[PDB]
């Protein structure tokens, strides 16, 4: 079997992407962030507190001929930005881009932070790293991947994601019209959970090419890039006027500004983020200071490659017994 789903930025910004992900029978559609730096399928519901909805679409269990209360079990996540969710769980079919998954856990949300609730766009998260960070209790659930995978024509799937425009998840396949050149695969770690790899070095604009390994995620569920602090400064030293803000939280440039591409290594491949992908605009509303897309992670302690890296690439997340991640330009 195969799947392959659109998924949309939520913003002009491309602060998120949604798919759409069918729930229930008869189905109940709702537009999910598929977040490969984390392994539980949450749902705002018909449980949600109601003062905690805003807009969103909610999933009710009662209105499924194919729910189940998976009785006793619970969750609770917490994610990097502070933003966090918990209830009970479901056991459902869920479908996406056409491939379906009978028995799915689907976590309802009786509770979430209020970034949640302020963003209508967002009616819950997919999570797409190892099973082995999804957060029920007592018994652990695995995702829509790992129970897809053994269905699947290829143990595989792939993130497209648009420059201000759309994109596509595919399940079970390689769409090799998708890409241009080859795909490059790198090794993973899974010890953390999550889609680990090394990165060959950087590049700054026109700037010769820096060897060093660093150690990040590939997370599809993280708006922007998060590097070590030498690399970022290394970043922004080219940008007139960019600084630090400790009042705004990290990096911010002239809005008058061209930015340089930066190139990140795969191997000896390379990935070339424009300068336009790094301009997350201005910080408020009529502001000539614009957020940048390049970040430090010294406060995190992890390397981050979000959306701003994974949009510059097609990206293969193979779940084969020795999981590897594989990029190319597109």
């Known amino acids: 079997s195969t799947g392959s789903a659109t998924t949309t930025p939520i913003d002009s ?8 992900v069918q729930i229930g029978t008869p189905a109940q559609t709702l ?12 749902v705002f519901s018909s449980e949600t507190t109601a003062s905690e909805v805003d807009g969103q679409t ?10 189940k209360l998976l009785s006793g079990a619970t969750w609770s996540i917490s994610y990097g930005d502070g933003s966090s969710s918990s209830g009970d769980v479901y056991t459902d079919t869920v479908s996406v881009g ?10 309802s949300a009786k509770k979430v932070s209020s970034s949640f609730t302020e963003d209508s766009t967002i009616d819950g998260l997919l999570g797409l790293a190892f099973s082995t960070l999804n957060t029920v209790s007592p018994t652990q659930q695995k995702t829509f991947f790992d129970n897809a995978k053994a269905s699947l024509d290829s143990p595989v799937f792939t993130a497209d994601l648009g420059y201000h425009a759309p994109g596509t998840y595919n399940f079970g396949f390689i769409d090799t019209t998708a890409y241009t050149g080859s795909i490059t695969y790198t090794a993973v770690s899974t010890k953390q959970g999550f889609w680990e790899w090394t990165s060959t ?3 700054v604009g ?12 590939a997370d599809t569920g993280t708006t922007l890039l998060y590097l070590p602090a030498t690399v970022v400064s290394a970043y922004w030293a080219q940008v007139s006027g960019a600084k630090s803000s400790s009042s705004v939280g990290g990096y911010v440039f002239p809005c008058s500004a061209t930015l340089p591409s930066f190139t990140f ?21 009529g502001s000539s200071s614009c957020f940048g897309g390049i970040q430090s992670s010294a406060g995190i302690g992890i390397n981050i490659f979000g959306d701003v890296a994974l949009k510059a690439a097609f990206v293969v997340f193979n779940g084969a017994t020795t999981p590897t991640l594989g990029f190319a330009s597109k």
Do not use: C, H
Request: no cysteine; net charge negative.
């Open 31 to 42: 537009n999910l962030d598929f977040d490969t730096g984390s392994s539980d399928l949450w």
């Open 98 to 107: 056409g491939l379906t998954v009978t028995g799915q856990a689907v976590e």
């Open 58 to 67: 909610i999933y009710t269990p009662s209105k499924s001929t194919t729910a």
């Open 201 to 203: 070095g950087y590049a």
């Open 206 to 217: 026109s700037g010769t090419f820096k060897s060093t390994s660093i150690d990040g995620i």
């Open 13 to 20: 910004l491309d602060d998120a992407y949604i798919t759409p």
């Open 265 to 285: 290594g795969v191997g000896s491949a390379r990935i070339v983020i424009p300068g336009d992908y790094i301009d997350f605009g201005p910080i408020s509303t």
